[PDB]
Amino acid sequence: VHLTDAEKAAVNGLWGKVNPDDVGGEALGRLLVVYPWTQRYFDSFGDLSSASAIMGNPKVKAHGKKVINAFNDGLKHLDNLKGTFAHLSELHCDKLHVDPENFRLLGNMIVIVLGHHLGKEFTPCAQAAFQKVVAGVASALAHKY
Amino acid sequence: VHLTDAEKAAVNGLWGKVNPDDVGGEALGRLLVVYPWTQRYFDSFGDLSSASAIMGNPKVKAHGKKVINAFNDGLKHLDNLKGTFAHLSELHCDKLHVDPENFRLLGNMIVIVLGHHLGKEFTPCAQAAFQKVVAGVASALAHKYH
Amino acid sequence: VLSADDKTNIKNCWGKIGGHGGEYGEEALQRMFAAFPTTKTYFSHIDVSPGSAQVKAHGKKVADALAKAADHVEDLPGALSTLSDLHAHKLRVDPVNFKFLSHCLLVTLACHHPGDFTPAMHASLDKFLASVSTVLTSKYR
Amino acid sequence: VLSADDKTNIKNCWGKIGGHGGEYGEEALQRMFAAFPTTKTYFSHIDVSPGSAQVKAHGKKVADALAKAADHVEDLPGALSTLSDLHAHKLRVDPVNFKFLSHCLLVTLACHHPGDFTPAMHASLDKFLASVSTVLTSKYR
Numbered sequence: 098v099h100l101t102d103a104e105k106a107a108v109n110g111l112w113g114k115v116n117p118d119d120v121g122g123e124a125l126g127r128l129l130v131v132y133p134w135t136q137r138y139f140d141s142f143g144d145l146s147s148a149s150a151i152m153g154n155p156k157v158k159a160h161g162k163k164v165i166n167a168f169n170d171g172l173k174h175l176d177n178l179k180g181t182f183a184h185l186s187e188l189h190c191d192k193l194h195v196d197p198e199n200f201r202l203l204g205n206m207i208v209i210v211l212g213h214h215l216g217k218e219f220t221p222c223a224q225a226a227f228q229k230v231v232a233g234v235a236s237a238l239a240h241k242y
Numbered sequence: 243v244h245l246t247d248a249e250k251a252a253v254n255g256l257w258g259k260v261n262p263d264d265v266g267g268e269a270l271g272r273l274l275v276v277y278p279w280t281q282r283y284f285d286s287f288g289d290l291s292s293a294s295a296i297m298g299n300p301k302v303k304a305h306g307k308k309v310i311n312a313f314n315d316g317l318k319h320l321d322n323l324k325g326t327f328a329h330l331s332e333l334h335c336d337k338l339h340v341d342p343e344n345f346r347l348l349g350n351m352i353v354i355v356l357g358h359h360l361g362k363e364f365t366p367c368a369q370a371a372f373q374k375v376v377a378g379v380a381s382a383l384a385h386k387y388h
Numbered sequence: 389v390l391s392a393d394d395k396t397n398i399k400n401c402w403g404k405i406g407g408h409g410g411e412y413g414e415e416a417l418q419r420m421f422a423a424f425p426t427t428k429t430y431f432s433h434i435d436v437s438p439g440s441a442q443v444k445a446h447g448k449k450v451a452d453a454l455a456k457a458a459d460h461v462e463d464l465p466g467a468l469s470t471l472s473d474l475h476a477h478k479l480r481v482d483p484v485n486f487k488f489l490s491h492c493l494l495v496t497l498a499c500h501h502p503g504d505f506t507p508a509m510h511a512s513l514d515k516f517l518a519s520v521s522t523v524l525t526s527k528y529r
Numbered sequence: 530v531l532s533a534d535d536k537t538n539i540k541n542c543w544g545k546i547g548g549h550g551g552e553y554g555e556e557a558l559q560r561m562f563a564a565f566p567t568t569k570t571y572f573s574h575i576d577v578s579p580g581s582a583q584v585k586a587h588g589k590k591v592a593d594a595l596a597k598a599a600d601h602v603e604d605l606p607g608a609l610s611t612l613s614d615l616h617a618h619k620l621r622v623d624p625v626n627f628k629f630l631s632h633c634l635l636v637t638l639a640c641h642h643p644g645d646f647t648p649a650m651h652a653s654l655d656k657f658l659a660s661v662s663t664v665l666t667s668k669y670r
């Protein structure tokens with residue numbers, strides 16, 4: 098978790114002009130569409146058999162709100178990411194048995210949704226800074242293992 | 243690494259009846275055959291043109307000796323993989339930019355070479371114990387990413 | 389993608405396997421359950437104990453599928469589409485479990501056919517299992 | 530493997546891309562160099578500075594190759610055999626790099642065509658680039 102002063106100003110300067118709840122909703126929704134096997138882990142979610150269904154699913158939107166809230170903690174405490182994501186690391190790896198490679202997939206979904214929502218403002222430099230973050234958050238949840 | 247006492251006696255016993263030098267050499271060789279893009283990381287080794295060439299290569303055989311010595315140190319200090327491999331973690335990542343995904347590929351190559359050498363003695367249980375070691379070793383070299 | 393040499397080698401391997409197939413498929417599954425306990429999730433409904441007739445029978449089903457895939461190397465999506473619906477549409481298996489099983493299978497062959505398991509064969513077999521894995525995890529109907 | 534829906538989705542996207550291809554290839558590479566500085570090693574012999582004529586030229590080369598892959602979707606091994614010898618035999622490119630460029634290409638298309646970049650489109654394009662990557666890192670003849 099580098100984040101220089103220029104990378105700091107880019108991350109929170111651009112994070113402040115998106116709706117974080119919607120970002121988490123769409124990014125999760127897209128993960129379920131693009132990588133369909135992830136649907137299995139979310140069986141508490143009801144029907145997940147189509148693109149129109151899973152994007153309109155309330156349980157999905159509510160959970161993206163949960164997922165982005167945990168992500169938001171990360172930005173505040175980039176100094177101790179491994180300790181911030183302590184409980185969640187245990188949850189995904191022991192109770193849920195989620196393969197670590199799936200973490201970097203959801204991270205990528207977050208990244209492209211920002212781009213989807215921001216367009217030309219999501220510059221190559223701003224991607225790099227957000228890429229450093231999502232990779233850090235991925236290796237903080239996996240890191241048993 | 244977990245490792246129970248029966249899981250310990252399974253690892254040190256079967257390791258004792260193989261030649262680590264030969265296991266290291268073949269594992270590296272097989273990595274260079276099966277996953278050909280890794281050949282690029284070893285430019286220092288001269289031509290790696292074919293299966294026939296990369297197995298007879300004395301510089302591959304000698305490097306497999308170096309890889310397996312590091313692996314051997316792991317068995318002695320399973321309490322602290324992160325410290326045992328910290329120096330090599332810096333070399334492979336900061337200096338050579340080897341992607342962590344490759345680390346587990348060489349881990350797999352070691353496991354199959356053992357079964358190749360041990361036959362029906364490399365039991366499912368014996369594989370399970372060695373799988374924990376190689377995954378532990380792999381993630382100890384990647385621990386700088388983090 | 390598989391070359392001509394890959395095609396030749398896969399045929400030459402499943403010739404040597406022949407009827408020893410189910411025996412190895414059983415051992416592969418048994419290796420997978422032991423080395424990667426995560427995979428037991430997908431088999432909650434059957435007895436998975438080391439000695440188990442249900443695992444023995446499922447091994448024979450897997451071996452025939454690999455034998456069929458070896459026959460139709462040139463058209464893998466065609467021959468296996470029934471299994472692709474099972475694994476991708478119905479079961480939605482995580483693709484990492486296919487790497488786990490592919491590896492356990494390659495360990496098995498190395499234990500039983502170490503004269504035939506040359507680095508060049510290993511390569512051909514690994515690409516095979518990868519492209520068989522790709523079709524099975526992949527959803528196209 | 531790509532379904533029928535996957536193919537027509539690919540065809541429509543490269544339809545809607547038209548002449549803008551060169552700009553998106555360029556941008557994708559800039560993003561790959563910036564976000565994954567490891568990939569710069571492969572381009573040691575050209576100028577890789579943000580605004581670079583060499584990167585702009587290469588950007589267009591990539592776009593043409595992707596445009597040709599969208600035409601011959603049903604024969605990706607055939608259409609890109611030359612590019613497969615370049616990247617797999619000659620250049621020896623590590624597969625992760627393709628995942629890096631694929632992703633940076635999807636970010637670009639999301640930034641420029643957010644209306645047409647639906648969840649269902651994104652699934653098709655991710656699958657398309659994955660199969661393009663498989664062929665490119667493969668080694669046959």
Ligand code: HEM
Pocket residue numbers: 135138139141163164165167168185189193195199200203204234238
């Ligand atoms: C970006 C990384 C991720 C973050 C920040 C994250 C965050 C969270 C949080 C905060 C919860 C608990 C919600 C609560 O407090 O009630 C949760 C639960 C869960 N997560 Fe994740 N997650 C991540 C990655 C993933 C991925 C990729 C998967 C897909 C395999 C996954 C699967 C699950 C499941 C199945 C639950 C339980 C949901 C339930 O209560 O039914 N997680 N996640």
Ligand code: HEM
Pocket residue numbers: 280283284286308309310312313330334338340344345346348349379380383
């Ligand atoms: C998986 C466990 C691994 C172990 C235990 C290991 C071990 C070692 C050791 C001990 C050295 C330094 C020897 C010396 O200083 O003379 C070394 C160097 C090196 N390793 Fe590995 N390594 C591993 C993984 C890999 C993999 C998968 C690759 C393939 C990309 C790789 C590529 C290299 C390269 C390029 C060097 C330097 C080459 C040279 O000395 O000219 N390493 N390794």
Ligand code: HEM
Pocket residue numbers: 427430431449450453454471474475479481485486489490520521524
């Ligand atoms: C990699 C090559 C594989 C092949 C060729 C294969 C083949 C088969 C075959 C032939 C069947 C039986 C078809 C039937 O009559 O229902 C089956 C079922 C099944 N497979 Fe696989 N399989 C493979 C990998 C996997 C993996 C990696 C998993 C996950 C650990 C898995 C999980 C299952 C499950 C849960 C069933 C249904 C069992 C039942 O309910 O009877 N398969 N597969």
Ligand code: HEM
Pocket residue numbers: 568571572590591592594595612615616620622626627630661662665
């Ligand atoms: C699917 C994505 C990719 C496509 C469509 C693609 C296509 C191409 C094309 C069309 C060329 C020029 C062919 C020629 O006339 O020589 C080329 C060259 C090259 N590619 Fe790629 N490639 C891809 C991925 C990659 C990746 C991920 C890397 C590694 C970072 C890479 C490294 C190179 C290099 C080093 C050259 C030679 C450049 C030169 O000196 O002219 N390619 N590729």
